Amino acid sequence: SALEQFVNSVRQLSAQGQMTQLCELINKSGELLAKNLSHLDTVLGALDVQEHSLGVLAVLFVKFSMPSVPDFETLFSQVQLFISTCNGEHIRYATDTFAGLCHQLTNALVERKQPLRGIGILKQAIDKMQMNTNQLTSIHADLCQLCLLAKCFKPALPYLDVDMMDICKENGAYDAKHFLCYYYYGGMIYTGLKNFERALYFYEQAITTPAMAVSHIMLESYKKYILVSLILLGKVQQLPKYTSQIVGRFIKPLSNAYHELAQVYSTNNPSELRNLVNKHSETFTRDNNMGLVKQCLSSLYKKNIQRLTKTFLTLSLQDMASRVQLSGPQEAEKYVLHMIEDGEIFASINQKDGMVSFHDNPEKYNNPAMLHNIDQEMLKCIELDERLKAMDQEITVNPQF
Amino acid sequence: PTRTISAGKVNLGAFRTYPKGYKPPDEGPSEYQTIPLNKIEDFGVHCKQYYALEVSYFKSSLDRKLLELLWNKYWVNTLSSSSLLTNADYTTGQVFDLSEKLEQSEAQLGRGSEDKLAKATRDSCKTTIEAIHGLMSQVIKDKLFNQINI
Amino acid sequence: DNTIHGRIDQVNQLLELDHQKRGGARYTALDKWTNQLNSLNQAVVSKLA
Amino acid sequence: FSFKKLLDQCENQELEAPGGIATPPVYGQLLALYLLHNDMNNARYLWKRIPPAIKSANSELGGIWSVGQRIWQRDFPGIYTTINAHQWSETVQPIMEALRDATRRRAFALVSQAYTSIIADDFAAFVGLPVEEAVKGILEQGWQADSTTRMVLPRKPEQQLARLTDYVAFLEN
Amino acid sequence: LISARVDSHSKILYARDVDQRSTTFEKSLLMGKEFQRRAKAMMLRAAVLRNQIHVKSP
Amino acid sequence: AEHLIAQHSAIKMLHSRVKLILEYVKASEAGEVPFNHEILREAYALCHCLPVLSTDKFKTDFYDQCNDVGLMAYLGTITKTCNTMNQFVNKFNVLYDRQ
């Protein structure tokens, strides 16, 4: 009886003025909603399926049961049809139920099995929720989570590569754990793709978050921050002074093994790091980051080979095997060749004499390549300044203090 | 002379002092100039003891004629300037001073004058703008005489 | 005693005299400008929280 | 050139068609193409995404990954051995030859930069071709070959104004 | 104070001369990169302080 | 605008001289205007003087100049962005924050 009236009240606001009453209509909905909504969805796509379908589908996912009998797949396709060509315009005001729908779809796909297609659909929703230079919407975390479970990081990169400003809230629709999850999962995505620069950046941004209580997302991101900093840099990168007090008070002594790992890493001894990795092996496997510690061991060997460039020019492979502790010139030749290929060292191999010749001269800074590099880096600084000009202008327009 | 060359505009001032004990009027437009740190203290101490005259230039009827006719051949010298290496020591000297200005502007933000960073930014802007203008003339020369071929 | 400006190449048995002098004064000024800009940008970012 | 377009098309087919799980020949193409671009981080995560059902039903896919294990370990002779082991015409075979050629170019470019003097047998194993063929090719190219010691000595190999105006326009305002 | 490289093959100690230009360019470019990362970090810090994004205690 | 005006006038003068010599060449080649072995010979000698400096040492030096100004421009833009960041944070700490 009432469900037959609401649709008529949606058409009244269609192509008119304000839609705040429609937001109140989605806010109330009907509480004890019936199956009839599916029938109401048959005759609903009059203009562009409208915001009514969002309330219908959000309630369909809010059910905590079914959610549309064993034929839930039809509902999934309906959700697809709502995101793909349907989209919308006044999603900005209906962000609460939209992000809620995406969170419920994500949680349902996580609780079920393979969430591969869910990524493909989610990226469209994100594309229609954000403005132009992209905003940190809650759905950004869900996407990452999905692509972290269904091992496919490749299509999630364009949303991760952008250093987006301003978190999209609008009528609440945001929680701190979604921010923490986006930067932690994103950090794991960049770690999985061996892009340690952005990975370290993402973990650092996940730690900096203001906190009164300690969360497991912050602990795991801190552990992985130490590991990635030991891989990428020769030591642990200093976290900013504005990091939460709980990090230095609770997170630091909880992940003691990692600071113990960095303490053994600083002595430049591989056998001792090997002994420490074997000592807390159960703790590293418990956190599910065993592999990154092996990369820390390999990066310590790399660091020890890198330290030879500062003192030697032409060094014997046997001398390198003795100094770095590799056993045999064969492993030294392997390590040097891998390091040249990966662009980690600037050296050459002489097999006849069994020597390694360090050059250490990548560039002389006369190429146009540097001209284009500097032009691109300057354009990045100009972009940053123009963004800062926009933020400063926006603040100047606002009331005084 | 250094700023004349680097800016491509004559940097000259004409001044007259006030007698000992005499106080200046409200007038003092004071057109902004970057003053290096090793000179700014002395500048500030004595800046109100003199005033600047309004400078203008003149030439004769013959100078006018001769300078137009000189241009008919002097144009060659404008396309063979090489300003970037003529007074290269100036930009380096300014950068050397700019770094200490930036050290002072950092010290201002440290604990606790009126915005030294903005002054230093205008100084670095001016120096860089002059350097880019030098490169502009060099690129113009490259476009005119090198990118031709057979 | 700094009376002779140069160095000795004991292997090839020669005296490699100090001559290679270019505009090194710019790069030292740009070096100090870089250092001061590093410390400054750290101190500017330190303001917000 | 055209392989990148087929990769993007396969990357679209990876999510558009399923259904939950994508097509096995597309999985084979995507895996071999992920090996072609040397993106081992994409290939390793693609192989682990494959369900055990297609892993058991299509053994040829396992035969494609057996090349990837060698690429991951950087064992060049093993890469050239694993390439010439399986046949999957029209689908995987036309791109495996492109992988073989790309691995040859990658190995040649690596030896030319990383080595001053290298043993002829090691170099032949690095490029996959036999000792005689390799030595013939490098002598024709211009590398210094030496017998007895069997050493090969490799030889190591507005547009502008508008940008400047934008830089000054930035600084001056 | 020794600014040299050891050539252990021929047993000769060669003195190292720092390339002024390349070192200045290298450290300046790396400083620019570190500056950009600090700028992105504070951009996000401004965004979280604006939107009041923080972990609640209970 | 005021810095490249002297170059614009110099280039305009050069372009006039180049056009006058080119028109003399075409007039001689087409006919009617008297042929001269000596003048066109010097115009041939002038043509062969282009391009001025195509050596690798000059390319290294030109790009050395360009990279020096380029690096300096990058450090200058960094200083200006450092100042813009300082303005923004100084205002943000007043409006969005209570110091």
Next chain:
Amino acid sequence: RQDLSAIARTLQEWCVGCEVVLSGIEEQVSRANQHKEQQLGLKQQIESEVAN
């Protein structure tokens, strides 16, 4: 006499070259003003909001 055209072929190649450079400046100079005035105008809008 026959290959004389080649001289003109390079002279015109220089002329066109000048004609590009000249126009380039004309455009760049115009842009340098187009930005300036715009920025001034924008500043005058920001400065007009100070009264509110």
